Structures are given as C-alpha cells and as structure tokens.
Design an enzyme around this catalytic site. Structure first.
Site, mmCIF file in Angstrom:
data_model
loop_
_atom_site.group_PDB
_atom_site.id
_atom_site.type_symbol
_atom_site.label_atom_id
_atom_site.label_comp_id
_atom_site.label_asym_id
_atom_site.label_seq_id
_atom_site.Cartn_x
_atom_site.Cartn_y
_atom_site.Cartn_z
ATOM 1 N N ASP A 94 -6.177 -1.153 2.700
ATOM 2 C CA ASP A 94 -6.563 -0.228 3.743
ATOM 3 C C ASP A 94 -6.991 -1.046 4.952
ATOM 4 O O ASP A 94 -7.912 -1.854 4.858
ATOM 5 C CB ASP A 94 -7.710 0.673 3.317
ATOM 6 C CG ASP A 94 -7.287 1.951 2.629
ATOM 7 O OD1 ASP A 94 -6.089 2.297 2.657
ATOM 8 O OD2 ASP A 94 -8.176 2.622 2.055
ATOM 9 N N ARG A 122 -5.763 1.881 -4.029
ATOM 10 C CA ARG A 122 -4.631 1.415 -3.206
ATOM 11 C C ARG A 122 -4.730 -0.069 -2.937
ATOM 12 O O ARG A 122 -5.819 -0.653 -2.933
ATOM 13 C CB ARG A 122 -4.603 2.280 -1.945
ATOM 14 C CG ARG A 122 -5.505 1.860 -0.815
ATOM 15 C CD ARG A 122 -6.928 2.354 -0.956
ATOM 16 N NE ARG A 122 -7.051 3.785 -1.161
ATOM 17 C CZ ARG A 122 -7.057 4.776 -0.288
ATOM 18 N NH1 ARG A 122 -6.932 4.548 1.016
ATOM 19 N NH2 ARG A 122 -7.190 6.029 -0.725
ATOM 20 N N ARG A 143 0.828 -1.207 0.000
ATOM 21 C CA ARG A 143 0.000 0.000 0.000
ATOM 22 C C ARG A 143 0.863 1.258 0.000
ATOM 23 O O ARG A 143 1.752 1.411 0.831
ATOM 24 C CB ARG A 143 -0.932 0.044 1.210
ATOM 25 C CG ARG A 143 -1.511 1.432 1.477
ATOM 26 C CD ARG A 143 -2.139 1.482 2.853
ATOM 27 N NE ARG A 143 -3.395 2.229 2.902
ATOM 28 C CZ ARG A 143 -3.440 3.480 3.352
ATOM 29 N NH1 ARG A 143 -2.320 4.060 3.764
ATOM 30 N NH2 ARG A 143 -4.582 4.145 3.395
ATOM 31 N N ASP A 165 -8.425 0.059 8.441
ATOM 32 C CA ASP A 165 -8.900 1.223 9.172
ATOM 33 C C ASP A 165 -9.634 0.788 10.432
ATOM 34 O O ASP A 165 -10.539 -0.043 10.403
ATOM 35 C CB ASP A 165 -9.822 2.074 8.293
ATOM 36 C CG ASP A 165 -9.073 2.983 7.344
ATOM 37 O OD1 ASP A 165 -8.089 3.641 7.750
ATOM 38 O OD2 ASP A 165 -9.483 3.025 6.160
HETATM 39 N N1 LIG Z 1 -15.837 2.115 -1.915
HETATM 40 C C1 LIG Z 1 -14.835 2.636 -1.248
HETATM 41 N N2 LIG Z 1 -14.336 3.839 -1.490
HETATM 42 C C2 LIG Z 1 -13.296 4.355 -0.783
HETATM 43 C C3 LIG Z 1 -12.646 3.601 0.317
HETATM 44 C C4 LIG Z 1 -13.185 2.279 0.593
HETATM 45 O O1 LIG Z 1 -12.783 1.454 1.491
HETATM 46 N N3 LIG Z 1 -14.242 1.887 -0.208
HETATM 47 N N4 LIG Z 1 -11.567 4.157 1.039
HETATM 48 C C5 LIG Z 1 -11.130 5.419 0.699
HETATM 49 C C6 LIG Z 1 -10.006 6.047 1.420
HETATM 50 O O2 LIG Z 1 -10.400 6.215 2.741
HETATM 51 P P1 LIG Z 1 -9.916 7.439 3.453
HETATM 52 O O3 LIG Z 1 -9.082 7.049 4.655
HETATM 53 O O4 LIG Z 1 -10.972 8.408 3.940
HETATM 54 O O5 LIG Z 1 -8.936 8.375 2.584
HETATM 55 P P2 LIG Z 1 -7.402 8.081 2.372
HETATM 56 O O6 LIG Z 1 -7.017 8.166 0.929
HETATM 57 O O7 LIG Z 1 -7.129 6.719 3.015
HETATM 58 O O8 LIG Z 1 -6.660 9.148 3.070
HETATM 59 P P3 LIG Z 1 -6.333 9.140 4.682
HETATM 60 O O9 LIG Z 1 -7.255 8.158 5.352
HETATM 61 O O10 LIG Z 1 -6.416 10.596 5.061
HETATM 62 O O11 LIG Z 1 -4.778 8.598 4.699
HETATM 63 P P4 LIG Z 1 -4.435 7.208 5.270
HETATM 64 O O12 LIG Z 1 -3.186 6.744 4.554
HETATM 65 O O13 LIG Z 1 -5.546 6.219 5.234
HETATM 66 O O14 LIG Z 1 -4.216 7.477 6.834
HETATM 67 C C7 LIG Z 1 -3.357 8.623 7.281
HETATM 68 C C8 LIG Z 1 -3.207 8.493 8.753
HETATM 69 O O15 LIG Z 1 -4.512 8.546 9.372
HETATM 70 C C9 LIG Z 1 -4.354 8.081 10.685
HETATM 71 N N5 LIG Z 1 -5.637 7.485 11.151
HETATM 72 C C10 LIG Z 1 -6.501 8.289 11.952
HETATM 73 N N6 LIG Z 1 -7.564 7.682 12.415
HETATM 74 C C11 LIG Z 1 -7.397 6.376 11.883
HETATM 75 C C12 LIG Z 1 -8.281 5.270 12.070
HETATM 76 N N7 LIG Z 1 -9.359 5.222 12.725
HETATM 77 N N8 LIG Z 1 -7.882 4.017 11.411
HETATM 78 C C13 LIG Z 1 -6.758 4.005 10.706
HETATM 79 N N9 LIG Z 1 -5.848 5.038 10.479
HETATM 80 C C14 LIG Z 1 -6.241 6.242 11.118
HETATM 81 C C15 LIG Z 1 -3.135 7.169 10.703
HETATM 82 O O16 LIG Z 1 -2.130 7.686 11.616
HETATM 83 C C16 LIG Z 1 -2.647 7.223 9.262
HETATM 84 O O17 LIG Z 1 -1.250 7.158 9.141
HETATM 85 C C17 LIG Z 1 -11.756 6.237 -0.417
HETATM 86 N N10 LIG Z 1 -12.773 5.586 -1.020
HETATM 87 MG MG LIG Z 2 -7.370 6.048 5.084
#
Ligand SMILES: Nc1nc2c(c(=O)[nH]1)N=C(COP(=O)(O)OP(=O)(O)OP(=O)(O)OP(=O)(O)OC[C@H]1O[C@@H](n3cnc4c(N)ncnc43)[C@H](O)[C@@H]1O)CN2
Ligand SMILES: [Mg+2]
Ligand SMILES: [Cl-]
Length: 158
Positions: free
Chosen positions: A95, A92, A82, A97
C-alpha cells in the site's frame, strides 16, 4: 512539495516489500526521500484473520503533481504484486497511500487528500508524528493534539 506517504504491507515478507517500496520511491523522478519513520508492527484495522501490518511513514520531497505522484506510486504497488480486491481491509503485499500533499486539500475522482479517515488511524498518525512532530492539518487541527486527546494505542516496533 513534501508528500507524506504511508507504507503498509502484511503479505510476502512485509520488511522486504517495504524496503523495495523505499527504493522505488526515491527512484521517483524529480523526487527524493527527506525522512523515513521507524518500522512498526500494527494490528489489522478490520478483519483479524490476517498477519499484522508493517507500517511506516515517509517524507518525500517531489516536484510531481499530486495525481502525477499517484501514477508513480501506483506503478510500484503493481510492481510489488498488490492485488485489487473487492472488499476493503483484506491483506495485501503493498500500500502506498498519500496521507498529505504539502498543505493541500484534494478531492478528485482518484485522489482524496488528506487521506480519508486518517485522523482516526494510529498506524498512520504515529509514524507521521515521528517524522513531523510539528505537523498541522489544512483545517488547522494539530497532529500532536489529535494524538494527545485520545489515548491511541502505542505502536510496537516491527
Ligand atoms: N494495521 C493496518 N491495518 C490496515 C492498513 C494498514 O496500513 N495498517 N491498511 C488498510 C487498507 O487501507 P484502506 O485504503 O482504507 O482500505 P483499502 O482496502 O486499501 O481499500 P481502498 O483504500 O478503498 O482501495 P485502494 O486500492 O487502496 O484505493 C482505491 C483508490 O483510492 C484512490 N485514493 C484516494 N485517495 C487516495 C490517497 N490519499 N492515497 C492513495 N490512493 C488514494 C486511488 O485512486 C485508488 O485507486 C486496512 N487496514
Ligand atoms: Mg487503500
Ligand atoms: Cl484536514
């Protein structure tokens, strides 16, 4: 403590990425998988020029602390190629989460729990509801209610 983890993948054969994650997760020390949801194909949340996601929810019993659980899941992500990408919501391989961590509310430098904006995300909410229909968020908001008062799109199975 029951940690509910959301699994997503839309690169490098999502089903294999997800099965891999599921093997490593149970391999986490002092932890075991209570339950896994079904496998769903879900449309990208942001930009559409990428494959649909495989999404799942897991109930992981763990003795690890929240940020200790994050070190472990993040290893596994890294292990699954990832990539740290600038702009969010691009595709990616993996994930992991943490949606919820027991009934806790964590707002640290590294961890936000319950996961930011997850109450507006069917790909997170439907699998979860599949494995914990009785779930209530720390603020008292009930999951079945949240899923009832908006007609969130139905998930197709992967
Ligand atoms: N259909 C569908 N569509 C999707 C899906 C999906 O699963 N299904 N996922 C995303 C991305 O999810 P999203 O996290 O909102 O956006 P990302 O591109 O991942 O961007 P991000 O989450 O801001 O970056 P990241 O690399 O996931 O994460 C950046 C930092 O957030 C921190 N972090 C904070 N809270 C958490 C938590 N509860 N669980 C995990 N990590 C958490 C940790 O310290 C981590 O290093 C977009 N679209
Ligand atoms: Mg994320
Ligand atoms: Cl909450």
């Amino acid at each position: 403590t029951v940690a509910y983890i959301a699994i997503g993948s839309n690169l490098a054969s999502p089903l294999e990425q997800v099965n891999a994650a599921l093997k490593a997760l149970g391999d986490i020390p002092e932890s075991h998988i209570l339950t896994v949801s079904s496998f769903y194909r879900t449309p990208p949340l942001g930009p559409q020029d990428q494959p649909d996601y495989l999404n799942a929810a897991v109930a992981l019993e763990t003795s690890l602390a929240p940020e200790e659980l994050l070190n472990h899941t993040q290893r596994i992500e890294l292990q699954q190629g990832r990539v740290r990408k600038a702009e969010r919501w691009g595709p990616r391989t993996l994930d992991l989460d943490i949606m919820l961590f027991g009934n806790e509310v964590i707002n640290t430098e590294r961890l936000t729990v319950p996961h930011y904006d997850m109450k507006n995300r069917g790909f997170m909410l439907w699998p979860l509801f599949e494995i914990a229909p009785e779930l209530v968020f720390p603020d008292g908001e009930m999951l079945r209610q949240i899923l009832h008062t908006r007609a969130f799109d139905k998930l197709n199975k992967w």
